[PDB]
Ligand binder design. Structure first.
Ligand SMILES: CC(=O)N[C@@H]1[C@@H](O[C@@H]2O[C@H](CO)[C@H](O)[C@H](O[C@]3(C(=O)O)C[C@H](O)[C@@H](NC(C)=O)[C@H]([C@H](O)[C@@H](O)CO)O3)[C@H]2O)[C@@H](O)[C@@H](CO)O[C@H]1O
Ligand SMILES: CC(=O)N[C@@H]1[C@@H](O[C@@H]2O[C@H](CO)[C@H](O)[C@H](O[C@]3(C(=O)O)C[C@H](O)[C@@H](NC(C)=O)[C@H]([C@H](O)[C@@H](O)CO)O3)[C@H]2O)[C@@H](O)[C@@H](CO)O[C@H]1O
Ligand SMILES: CC(=O)N[C@@H]1[C@@H](O[C@@H]2O[C@H](CO)[C@H](O)[C@H](O[C@]3(C(=O)O)C[C@H](O)[C@@H](NC(C)=O)[C@H]([C@H](O)[C@@H](O)CO)O3)[C@H]2O)[C@@H](O)[C@@H](CO)O[C@H]1O
Ligand SMILES: CC(=O)N[C@@H]1[C@@H](O[C@@H]2O[C@H](CO)[C@H](O)[C@H](O[C@]3(C(=O)O)C[C@H](O)[C@@H](NC(C)=O)[C@H]([C@H](O)[C@@H](O)CO)O3)[C@H]2O)[C@@H](O)[C@@H](CO)O[C@H]1O
Ligand SMILES: Nc1cc[n+]([C@@H]2O[C@H](COP(=O)(O)O)[C@@H](O)[C@H]2O)c(=O)[nH]1
Ligand SMILES: Nc1cc[n+]([C@@H]2O[C@H](COP(=O)(O)O)[C@@H](O)[C@H]2O)c(=O)[nH]1
Ligand SMILES: Nc1cc[n+]([C@@H]2O[C@H](COP(=O)(O)O)[C@@H](O)[C@H]2O)c(=O)[nH]1
Ligand SMILES: Nc1cc[n+]([C@@H]2O[C@H](COP(=O)(O)O)[C@@H](O)[C@H]2O)c(=O)[nH]1
Lengths: 245, 245, 245, 245
């Protein structure tokens, strides 16, 4: 079946909606909820978060669902089983702290040839795929055959929204393209799936062919008084989770 | 099949016995044996104890069985796989120290949606279900469909008995309602089971409908010269178990 | 099928051979090879050694087999998964250091009720079964139905041989009955097997009925120039095994 | 089916090619690529590397494949699950750092009798088989029935090539026969396979019968401007792998 995978680059705001497939699931990641409109609707099949902020993102996502801003069926942590990248205890105890979520690596590792591809480039050449590509690998492992890409701009404005929000900055004060492109080519060739681009003005469209025009319609709902920053758990909550950070 | 789940609140002494089901199993917990009469009989299907006193409670239970005060088929430890709540070595080595007992979490975790529900409230909001509710989740995991509740009073006298006994005080010198009520509602709705209340005068009866009057009979046997305090193992026994405390 | 289980008490020298069963396997333990005659033949189905001397006993057994003194099909370590009794790394790495041997606990633990029985008495009352009884439990787990006992004397001369040998003393300078008797009664009743005694003059014969007289014959071969002390591995070998001691 | 197993001794240069089997797979190890000609072709079924240099050898092998110098289907690490021989974290995390490779021990250990044979000699007598013999055991575990040996000379010039290369010396400045011979005899007798020698002038041919002359042909391709030293990863790569070295 068919999936739309969305990064959070500026092209998220410039999807050509006549090229949307007839039916589909949606994958989102990281600060997706910062978007000022529902560019791909409220309903997610899966959302993906990095280990470094998973504790805060899970808490924030439960707020989004309760407040009827989004829904999702799956919740994934984008990990790799690498000591230099992730806390060992966090991975070991994951299913006991977050019983309705999944370690993304449990799916990523089912693609042996791609896992090998990723590890060689990360360890020896310091070349790492982004979340956009990570989500593609997980979709392929779950059985999707046609993947439609949006919001992937290779960092050239940084984002489809203003990302410099108070709480996020408190947690992460920090707030090439070859790596992602070669990885997508490998996935397509190795696993016999099809990639499409939904964003004609994106740099991605230079490398990946456009989804065909099907005269599809889509209503873009605007958002108001919405959650536009990550939420920060209590000091007692951090105390309980402190081995895993 | 049918189960009666008993906490140790004052309502344990005020069961309406005409509402007992036609056939049933009984679950008890913690200091249940402090009761001055056999309010639910001598025969237990399962008994539940917290990790913090399991070593002493297991020793005490073997005395109760040998002395013909109670019998039980199952022995459960009420754990959650949470580092802030339980000793890691205790859980790791449990089946080798207590081969005829079970970790309650081995059953609790089979209810994925409830495990997620519990963990979110405990970790982020410092809201924890009590043993009464824990036993309900385990019963549901074991296949019970009709659950009859007693001895659940939400701590307002503290107990159906005087709990301030010498040994217990030596081990634990320490000797809201929304959390338990919302959790029971979730269990009932999610797993399609039925909850009943056996205690008409209890606060519980404001939230959970009464078991129907079936004109049942029950003989309440009085107790004499009985074990009414926890027993304390030898210093040599503590020495052997010291990694797990 | 039928098994003869032998301890190393003085009664090993006073078997009534007319009571030997028509066909059988033999279990031996610890310093059995110190015997001055082949009281039960050269062929063992299994030999059992304690964790504390396993490293040296395994080395010694390979010498016995090469020198054509004994043979055995199985090699067992008599462990319990108890931190106060055995080195944790020794158990964890056992199958990689001794690939043709077994941890006895892998069989012992298949008898859940007896494992529980043993652990309760050891941990809380400092009452421990001996190797003789351990071997019985393992035989029952392996499917034996009729067990014939010898060399079990409850330590009242200590042994059927002089145990005060140079190397053994170097490794272990140290070189009641109720516990073993109650444990054997439990095994017999719980698992529905039959116990017999082969040694009419033993204290054991006061508690366990004699094997029936079948007019069987047995040739007792004498031993000469034989291995009558444990062997000590090189200092380099100890260096390699030092985490496990 | 049929396999040629090659060590890197001087006899690698003196194969009698009329004795090559009609069809076959090839196993190579360690510094095989230092060879000045393709003595057994470019195509390997498997290549084997020691834990001590695996990090650098894997990196080097990926270069060889990209540069079209060799190909291989399998990549094996020649380990034994022994603390004195290999880094514990290296083994624990192996499949996550090298997803397209295998721990050789996962196959070696399938030969229980040989694993026991190896461990006894290594631990107690400081007698260790070489990589040549290790590869034979792995071939047998994978189902091969006829094994053809080359490049096994028992270290008497050291090698079929000059091994004193700059990078290798930087990583390993260090750059009897009874053990290997008795181990090969054990493998042959125990697992019912056939061993042949391809090198008539080798010391091996004194102990193992020659492969029959089949009038086979083989073209020995010369090598030019080829990789003749191990490659050294960046300091950043070592930083990431530092727990495993
Ligand atoms: C991108 C980079 O290398 N940044 C360097 C910093 O490294 C980051 O350090 C963090 C410390 O908690 C985390 O370990 C980051 O690791 C993750 C993460 O964010 O959790 C691991 C994820 O698996 C990975 N996600 C994917 C899909 O690959 C993310 C991801 O790469 C992004 O967050 C990167 O923007 O990273 C880890 O990247 C740090 O060493 C500083 C030095 O102090 O240098 C930065 O250059
Ligand atoms: C209730 C509470 O938070 N009390 C606080 C103390 O926390 C207790 O500390 C104990 C130290 O050994 C245990 O870790 C207690 O944890 C358990 C337990 O009793 O073993 C874990 C059980 O899984 C849990 N049982 C259930 C069914 O949820 C029990 C249970 O919640 C009751 O025993 C609570 O009455 O707790 C742990 O609760 C401690 O931090 C002191 C500070 O020193 O503050 C108390 O407020
Ligand atoms: C018998 C006793 O309690 N002796 C006390 C000593 O305890 C011994 O300490 C040893 C130190 O390496 C071992 O841990 C002994 O544990 C075993 C063993 O010999 O390996 C564990 C075995 O599972 C057990 N075998 C069986 C079949 O039960 C043996 C066995 O009980 C006999 O070896 C006992 O004679 O023990 C452990 O028993 C030690 O604490 C000294 C104090 O320094 O006090 C002794 O009383
Ligand atoms: C051969 C020997 O005993 N050399 C002694 C040194 O021991 C070497 O130390 C290394 C330190 O990183 C490694 O642990 C070597 O272990 C392996 C290896 O090279 O990785 C383990 C492999 O499984 C083994 N391979 C096979 C197929 O058996 C190799 C192999 O034996 C060869 O590399 C040996 O030439 O060894 C380990 O052997 C070291 O203790 C020095 C003292 O400082 O003394 C040397 O005699
Ligand atoms: N300018 C951008 C911002 C994000 N992306 C993609 O969106 C994904 C989510 O953004 P982030 O920076 O939070 O990882 C990111 O991993 C890339 O796949 C991009 O391609 N170009
Ligand atoms: N006053 C009371 C005392 C106990 N209970 C219940 O009885 C259970 C056992 O009592 P305890 O305090 O030992 O956990 C407790 O977990 C609650 O479920 C109660 O509801 N009200
Ligand atoms: N005097 C003795 C000596 C040994 N035994 C038995 O022989 C077994 C082996 O002797 P040992 O002391 O090495 O554990 C021992 O465990 C007992 O089961 C005995 O019963 N009486
Ligand atoms: N002179 C030699 C060199 C190597 N070998 C064999 O070649 C194998 C690979 O060589 P190496 O030294 O890297 O382990 C080695 O393990 C032996 O099996 C040999 O037999 N004689």
């Amino acid at each position: 079946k068919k999936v739309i995978i969305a990064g959070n680059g500026p092209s998220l705001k410039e999807i050509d909606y006549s090229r949307l497939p007839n039916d589909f699931d949606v994958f989102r990641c990281n600060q997706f909820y910062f978007e000022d409109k529902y560019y791909l609707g409220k309903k997610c099949k899966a959302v993906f978060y990095n280990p470094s902020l998973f504790f805060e993102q899970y808490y924030t996502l439960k707020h989004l669902i309760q407040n009827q801003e989004y829904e999702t069926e799956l919740i994934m942590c984008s990990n790799y089983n690498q000591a230099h990248l992730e806390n060992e205890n966090f991975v070991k105890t994951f299913y006991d702290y977050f019983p309705d979520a999944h370690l993304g690596y449990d799916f990523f590792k089912q693609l042996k040839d791609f896992n090998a591809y990723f590890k060689f480039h990360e360890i020896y050449f310091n070349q790492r795929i982004t979340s956009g590509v990570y989500m593609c690998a997980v979709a392929i492992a779950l059985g999707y055959k046609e993947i439609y890409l949006s919001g992937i701009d290779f960092y050239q404005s940084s984002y489809a929204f203003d990302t410099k929000q108070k709480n996020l900055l408190k947690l992460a004060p920090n707030f090439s393209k070859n790596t992602d492109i070669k990885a997508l080519e490998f996935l397509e060739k190795t696993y016999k799936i099809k990639l499409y681009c939904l964003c004609p003005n994106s740099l991605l469209a230079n490398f990946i062919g456009l989804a065909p025009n099907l005269n599809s319609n889509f209503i873009i709902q605007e958002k108001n008084n919405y959650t536009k920053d990550i939420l920060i758990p209590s000091s007692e909550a951090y105390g309980k989770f402190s081995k895993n950070i």
